[PDB]
RNA sequence: GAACUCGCUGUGAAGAUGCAGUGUACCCGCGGCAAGACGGAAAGACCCCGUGAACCUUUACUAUAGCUUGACACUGAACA
Ligand SMILES: [K+]
Ligand SMILES: [K+]
Ligand SMILES: [Mg+2]
């Protein structure tokens with residue numbers, strides 16, 4: 001799952017970095033805690 | 042089924058009131074008895090048959106609930 005990082009996340013990247021994560025990591029952590037957003041445009 | 046519904050010895054789907062031969066016997070009740078009418082009752086339960094049934098058994102066959110195995114999914118993060 002492609003997401004855009006918003007907060008600086010460790011072992012991933014920085015603000016605006018396009019990165020592929022496992023869907024569970026995005027769905028259950030990064031998105032609900034406001035660390036990433038889905039790469040919608 | 043209908044009867045004007047005797048004995049005997051034979052004959053005969055082979056154990057006869059009903060056939061043959063023969064013997065006996067006037068017509069009709071009532072009380073009794075059960076030897077026979079292969080008496081009545083129940084489409085033999087035994088026995089066999091039907092490519093009949095049911096339920097039961099099991100290391101008969103084929104399945105299958107359940108139980109159990111792993112893969113993928115729900116399921117992610119740091120090195121090992
Ligand atoms: K006679
Ligand atoms: K009798
Ligand atoms: Mg006789």
Ligand SMILES: [Mg+2]
Pocket residue numbers: none
């Ligand atoms: Mg009498």
Ligand SMILES: [Mg+2]
Pocket residue numbers: 075
């Ligand atoms: Mg009597």
Ligand SMILES: [Mg+2]
Pocket residue numbers: none
């Ligand atoms: Mg009888």
Ligand SMILES: [Mg+2]
Pocket residue numbers: 084
């Ligand atoms: Mg019969």
